[PDB]
Structure 1
Amino acid sequence: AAVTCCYNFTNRKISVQRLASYRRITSSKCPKEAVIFKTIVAKEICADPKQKWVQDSMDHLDKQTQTPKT
C-alpha cells in the first residue's frame, strides 16, 4: 500500500471543499515525509506536513468522518 513517494510539495493551499481524503507518507524510504490529499475528482496531490493548511485540512476531514449527519 506504500508504493509511492512525494518528490515535491504543492505550494498553494487547497480549499477544503475540494478535499475528499488523505494519506500520510511517513516512510523514511521516501525523500521526505508528506501528506497526499485525494480530491473530489480523484487527483492525488503531495503536500507539506508542516504547513498549517495541511494540518487544518486533516483535522477537518477527520471531524467529518467522525460526525456525519443523516
Structure 2
Amino acid sequence: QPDAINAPVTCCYNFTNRKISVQRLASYRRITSSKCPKEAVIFKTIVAKEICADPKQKWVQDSMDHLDKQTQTPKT
C-alpha cells in the first residue's frame, strides 16, 4: 500500500500560455505526480522561473522537445 501519502506533491495551478522563447527555457521538468490534479512542463526559464506549461500546446511541443534534446550529447 502507498505508505507515503503525506507527500509534498510538486504541482501547478496555471500554465504559461504565451509562446515563451525556447531560449528563455533554460530547462524543462515535466511534472506528473499521481497526486497532481494536472500534468505540466516545468519550463525552468533562465532566471530559474519554473513555468508550468500545458504540454498539450503547440508551442510547448516544440520547446519541450528542444529541451528534451538539449542535454543530449551524441558520443563522438
TM range (shorter): 0.7 to 0.9
Cα distance change of structure 1 residues 2 and 17 upon mapping to structure 2, 3 Å threshold: farther
Gaps (5+ residues) in structure 1?
none
- SS at structure 2 position matched to 1:4: strand
Structure 2 length normalisation: TM-score?
0.75
Give 2:61's match in structure 1, choosing from 55, 61, 67.
Answer: 55
Query: Per-residue deviation at 1:28?
Result: 2.5
Larger Rg: 2
- SS at structure 2 position matched to 1:7: coil
Whose helix fraction is larger, Structure 1's or Structure 2's? Answer: 1
Identity of aligned residues (%): 99
> Between Structure 1 and Structure 2, how many residues are aligned?
70
Structure 1 length normalisation: TM-score?
0.80
Query: Per-residue deviation at 1:63?
Result: 2.5
Gaps (5+ residues) in structure 2?
1-6
